[PDB]
Design an enzyme around this catalytic site. Structure first.
Site, PDB file in Angstrom:
ATOM      1  N   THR B   1     -80.872 -11.151 -28.747  1.00  0.00           N
ATOM      2  CA  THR B   1     -81.368 -11.816 -27.229  1.00  0.00           C
ATOM      3  C   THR B   1     -80.153 -11.386 -26.379  1.00  0.00           C
ATOM      4  O   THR B   1     -79.098 -11.365 -26.627  1.00  0.00           O
ATOM      5  CB  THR B   1     -81.549 -13.094 -27.122  1.00  0.00           C
ATOM      6  OG1 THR B   1     -82.746 -13.437 -28.120  1.00  0.00           O
ATOM      7  CG2 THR B   1     -81.788 -13.681 -25.674  1.00  0.00           C
ATOM      8  N   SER B  73     -86.643 -20.383 -26.820  1.00  0.00           N
ATOM      9  CA  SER B  73     -85.487 -21.524 -26.556  1.00  0.00           C
ATOM     10  C   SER B  73     -84.905 -20.795 -25.224  1.00  0.00           C
ATOM     11  O   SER B  73     -84.117 -21.420 -24.674  1.00  0.00           O
ATOM     12  CB  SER B  73     -84.590 -21.635 -27.690  1.00  0.00           C
ATOM     13  OG  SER B  73     -85.355 -22.082 -28.609  1.00  0.00           O
ATOM     14  N   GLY B  93     -78.882 -16.633 -27.864  1.00  0.00           N
ATOM     15  CA  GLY B  93     -78.340 -17.596 -29.084  1.00  0.00           C
ATOM     16  C   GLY B  93     -79.598 -18.523 -29.903  1.00  0.00           C
ATOM     17  O   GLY B  93     -79.239 -19.465 -29.980  1.00  0.00           O
ATOM     18  N   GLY B  94     -80.670 -18.004 -30.065  1.00  0.00           N
ATOM     19  CA  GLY B  94     -81.692 -18.625 -30.563  1.00  0.00           C
ATOM     20  C   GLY B  94     -81.708 -20.417 -30.181  1.00  0.00           C
ATOM     21  O   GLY B  94     -81.710 -20.459 -28.862  1.00  0.00           O
TER      22      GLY B  94
END
Lengths: 347, 186, 186, 349
Positions: B1, B73, B93-94
Site C-alpha cells: 500500500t 483500513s 500499513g494494513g
C-alpha cells in the site's frame, strides 16, 4: 526537520521522488490537484511496483475548490464467480496461501477506472498527457533504488512461482535486480499506451482484457472479460466528523478507516490531551483504549455497505464515544477479552 | 500500500491511498500486460475468527460474495478549518493505517506540532486482537513503558509503522503557504 | 559557532569547530575588509561570578590577561575503535556544546542508534548554574519529566540545542563506508 | 544518513560549503584540504558563524594513527586588562564585551587554516580558497534560516557603519530569503589571502584596515597584535568510553576535558539497560554534568597562563568518586556542589 514548502502552485507528495516530481511538475504546468493525482497514480504504477499499481485498487477523498467533499471508491470487486468458501478445503479449513499468492487471490482491478473517473469529473488536463511521464519511465526505465532491491529480494520466492512475474521482475536467468540496475518494463508500456489512447477501455476491454482473461483461465484464476467490462467505480459520500473545531473528512465503506478514525478521535476529544503533551502514558492510555474498542467494533460491524448494513452514523456519534470514554479507568485497562462490540448500545 | 497527497493554489485537495495489498500483491503478473495482480481477496474474512495478514478478524459483515468489495483500513483523510484545507493525510500499513493517520492528526491539533514533527513522531498501536501495545524502536522511554505495563498493557516493539505523506496548508495575508512532509520511515 | 566534520579514504579525519562567538559576533565589521569581528572577549570572566552570554562564571583561571586565550566550550571530537575512525562529531551552542556532543556519542555507543538517530534524538542540559534541567520541545514526556522533577530537577523547556554535523565510519567487507548526518535543528 | 564509500564525507551547516568540501575530496584532496576549503567557504556563506574574523579548534586523526590538535583560538589583545570591561565602580559596562570593537580578540581562523594546510594538507591554499572567492564575488542565495538570523541581529548591525553597509541591502533593508548576497570587500580580503597566504590578513593592507577601523571605533587591536598572532599545535585530551577512544580538544577549550570527564562518570552505569530517555540514565548524566561545570568555573582557563589540572579531571578515579556521590532518586542542589570535590587540592593552593 524543516517541512517541504511552497507558496505558489501547492504540493504533490508521494513515496517516490520520480512520482512526486511528476505530480509537482503538473502543478507547475497549470494542472489542478486532480490532474496531478492522476499523473502520480500512473507514475507510481511504474516506479513503485510493490504498491503503486494498475492491477489493484484504492480510495480518493477530495475537497473541491467550491467547498464540496467527495469520496471515490475504486476498490477491487470479488469476481462474478467468487464464493464464500472459495479459499477453504473440503473440510472448511483455510487452504494455505490460496488467498495470498496466485491468480485466484485477485479481485477485479479498479485503479485505472478510478484514475479516469476522477480525471473526467474534476480534472482539466487530458489523460494522454498526464500518463506520458509514466509511459516514458516504463519505456526507458529507472534506477532500482536501495529499498527496492531489498523488497524485490524479499519477494523473490513468490515471483518464482509464476512465469509471468519471473519474466518481468527478474533479469536474464531469473536473477534479482540490484540497486542501481536500470529497470525497463516494455509490456507495461504497451498497456499504458492502450490507456493513453483508448482511456479506461484500453484496460477493461480489447487486447488487455483478452490477455487478462486468457491468462486468468490458464492459471486457475476466475476474472473474465465480463468482470472487467462490469467493473465500476463508486462516488460515495465521505464519512465526516469534527475534532476540537476541525472538520474531519475520511473514507467511508468499503473502508473502515475513516469511520474508526473519527470514532477514536471522538473518544479522545473528551480529554484535554494538550495538558500533558505528546507521549504521556495518560494520553496514550486514553487513545489505546479508544482504539481497543474501535477495533472490536470493526470485527463485527464493518463490511461493504452495498451488501451489508454498516452502522457508520452510530459509530461516529459523539454520544457513543462519550460512553466509551467513561469506561476508561485512570490507571487500569479493559482487557480485550472483556471488550464487547458496540458496548451493547448501537440500538 | 502507498499514499499520496496533493493540494493546489485553487483550494482543491486530493488524498489518495491505493494498493495491491501485500508487497507486490499476489506476486503474479498478467502475461503480455506487464502488471502485477493484487491479492486483495485476503482482506475478506475467508473464515470466521480467522486473522488475516494483519491480524484482523471478521464474521459476516466482511465475508466473500460475488462483486463485493473487501473491507479496507485505508484512511485517506483531509482535515479542514473554516472550510479551508488544513491537512491532507494518509498512510499505508494494513491494520495500523487507522492508528497512524489518527496520531499524525492528533499530533498537529493536540500538541501543536508542525506537519514534519507530527509525521516524525514515534507511533504506538492497539488493535484489540492481539491484546498488545505495539511501539517503535526508541519510541517510548522506560518511565512511560513502566507506567503503561503497570496499567495492564503488554508492550511489544515491532518494525516502524507507516509511511505518511502529508501536507499542511496555512492561510497567508495574501495567499496560502503549503507545508509538506514525507515519512522518515520509508 | 558552527562545526564541520571531514573524513577521507586514507583514514584521516578532521573535526573543526570555529566561531565569532555570538550570532554575527560583535556585529561590527572591519570597514574595507568585509568581515565581522568576533565578540570572543565575553568568553573570559570579566568579573568574578558574573555570568557571561551562556550563564558561565569564573574567577582567576579564566580572568582577562594580555595575549591569553579565553576559555571555550568547543568540543570538536573524534571517536576511534581500534585506532580507526568511528565517529567525527562536534557542535555549536556555547555552554551547551559539551553536553550536546557527549549525548550524540552516548546515543551511538550506549543505545546503538545510527548517526542520524543519534543526532536527531532530543537533548537535555545541566550546567550547574543556573540550577535547572534544560530540555527541548517534545523532547521529554510527562512520565519522565515527573520522575525527574520528583528527584529535585527544575525542568525548563528552551530553544533547541546545537547543530551537529557528524560522520560515522564502519568497516566493510572491502574497505569502509562513510555515514553522515546534518542536524534538523540546523 | 547520507552515504559515501568512495572518497569519504565533508559535512557542514551550509550545503554550498559541504559541496565545496566534498568536491575537494572528489578531486583527490585529503581531509585537511577539504577542511580548509570549507573553512573559507563558510566565512562567506554562513557569516553568522563561519568566519575569518574569529577563531577555533581542529582535532585531527592522521592515517598513521597520530592524534593532534590545532589551537587557533583568538587571543586577548596586547593592551587587554583584567577589568577592561568594568567602570570605575567595578561594575560591568553593559554590552561592552558583547557589541562592538572592544569585544574582539585577535582573529586566528586564517592563521589556523594555513597552519593545518601546510603541515598536513596536499593542495595549495590558492586553489582551495577559490570556491569561497567565487561565492563572495558572484554571490549566493540567502536561505530561510539565514534571513531569520539576519533579521534578529538587525539592531546590532545598525550600530556600526561598516556592518550596515555589508549586511543590509540598499536602504537598510533586511536581506530576504532568495536574495543574492554579494560581498565584494570580503572577496578582496580573500584574494589577499589567496595571493599572500596568512600574511595577506595579518599584515599589509588588510592589517592596516583593521588597525585603522579599530582606532576609529574604540578598539585596541593593532598591527602588532596581528603580527603577533600565533596558533599552537597542542596534544588533544584523550580518554576512553566502553572500549572506544575519545579524542577531543584540550585547553584553551574546556570542552574535551569535561566531555571525557562526564562520560567517565556515566561509564560506571549500564545505560544500555534502560535505554534512551530513561529518567534513571538522565539522572546520572545530569549529576555528572552538574559536578563537571562546577569544576569548570574554578579550574578552567588558558593553561599557558594558569595551572589547569586536566589529567586529574579526566582521570577515571576522580570520575568514580563523583559517581559514588550521586545518590539514587535525588539530585545534589548546585548550592551544595563543591568544585573539585576535594580531589583537586594541590596542597594549600
Amino acid at each position: 526537520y524543516p517541512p517541504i514548502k511552497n507558496t505558489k502552485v501547492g504540493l504533490a507528495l508521494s513515496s517516490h521522488p520520480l512520482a512526486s516530481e511528476i505530480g509537482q511538475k503538473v502543478l507547475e504546468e497549470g494542472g489542478n490537484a486532480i490532474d496531478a493525482a492522476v499523473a502520480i497514480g500512473f507514475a507510481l504504477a511504474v516506479v513503485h511496483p510493490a504498491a503503486g499499481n494498475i492491477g489493484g485498487g484504492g480510495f480518493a477523498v477530495i475537497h473541491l475548490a467550491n467547498g464540496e467533499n467527495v469520496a471515490l471508491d475504486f476498490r477491487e470487486k470479488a469476481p462474478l464467480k467468487a464464493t464464500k468458501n472459495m479459499f477453504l478445503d473440503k473440510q472448511g479449513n483455510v487452504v494455505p496461501k490460496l488467498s495470498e499468492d496466485g491468480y485466484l487471490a485477485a479481485g477485479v482491478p479498479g485503479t485505472v477506472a478510478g484514475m479516469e473517473a476522477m480525471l473526467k469529473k474534476y480534472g482539466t488536463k487530458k489523460l494522454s498527457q498526464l500518463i506520458d511521464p509514466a509511459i516514458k519511465l516504463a519505456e526507458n526505465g529507472y534506477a532500482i533504488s536501495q529499498r527496492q532491491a531489498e523488497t524485490l529480494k524479499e519477494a523473490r520466492e513468490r515471483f518464482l512461482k509464476y512465469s509471468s512475474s519471473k519474466k518481468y521482475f527478474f533479469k536474464k536467468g531469473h536473477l534479482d535486480y540490484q540497486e542501481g540496475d536500470l529497470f525497463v518494463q516494455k509490456d507495461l508500456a504497451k498497456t499504458l499506451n492502450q490507456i493513453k489512447t483508448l482511456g479506461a477501455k484500453g484496460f477493461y476491454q480489447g487486447q488487455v482484457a483478452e490477455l487478462i482473461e486468457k491468462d486468468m483461465k490458464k492459471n486457475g484464476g476466475i476474472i473474465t472479460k465480463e468482470d472487467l467490462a462490469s467493473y465500476n467505480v463508486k462516488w460515495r459520500k465521505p464519512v465526516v466528523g469534527s475534532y476540537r473545531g476541525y472538520k474531519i473528512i475520511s473514507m467511508s465503506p468499503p473502508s473502515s478507516g475513516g469511520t474508526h478514525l473519527i470514532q477514536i478521535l471522538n473518544v479522545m476529544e473528551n480529554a484535554d490531551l494538550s495538558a500533558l503533551g505528546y507521549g504521556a502514558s495518560k494520553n496514550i492510555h486514553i487513545a489505546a483504549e479508544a482504539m481497543r474498542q474501535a477495533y472490536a467494533d470493526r470485527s463485527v460491524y464493518m463490511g461493504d455497505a452495498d451488501f451489508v448494513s454498516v452502522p457508520v452514523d452510530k459509530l461516529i456519534n459523539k454520544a457513543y464515544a462519550k460512553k466509551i470514554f467513561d469506561t476508561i479507568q485512570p490507571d487500569t485497562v479493559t482487557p480485550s477479552s472483556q471488550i464487547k462490540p458496540g458496548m451493547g448500545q448501537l440500538h | 500500500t502507498t499514499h499520496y497527497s496533493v493540494a493546489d493554489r485553487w483550494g482543491n485537495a486530493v488524498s489518495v491511498t491505493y494498493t495491491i495489498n501485500a508487497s507486490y500483491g499476489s506476486a503474479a503478473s498478467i502475461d503480455g500486460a506487464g502488471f502485477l495482480l493484487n491479492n486483495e481477496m485476503d482482506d475478506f474474512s475467508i473464515k470466521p475468527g480467522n486473522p488475516n495478514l494483519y491480524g484482523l478478524v471478521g464474521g459476516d459483515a466482511n465475508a466473500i460474495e460475488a462483486n463485493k468489495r473487501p473491507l479496507s483500513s485505508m484512511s485517506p483523510t483531509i482535515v479542514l478549518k473554516n472550510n479551508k484545507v488544513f491537512l491532507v493525510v494518509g498512510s499505508p500499513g494494513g491494520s495500523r493505517i487507522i492508528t497512524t493517520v489518527l496520531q499524525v492528526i492528533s499530533n498537529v491539533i493536540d500538541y501543536n506540532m508542525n506537519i514534519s514533527e507530527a509525521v516524525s513522531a514515534p507511533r504506538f498501536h492497539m488493535q484489540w486482537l492481539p491484546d498488545e501495545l505495539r511501539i517503535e524502536k526508541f519510541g517510548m522511554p522506560a518511565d512511560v513503558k513502566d507506567n503503561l505495563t503497570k496499567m495492564g498493557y503488554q508492550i511489544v516493539t515491532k518494525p516502524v509503522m507507516g509511511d505518511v505523506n502529508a501536507i499542511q496548508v496555512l492561510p497567508k495575508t495574501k495567499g496560502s503557504v503549503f507545508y509538506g512532509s514525507t515519512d522518515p520511515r520509508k
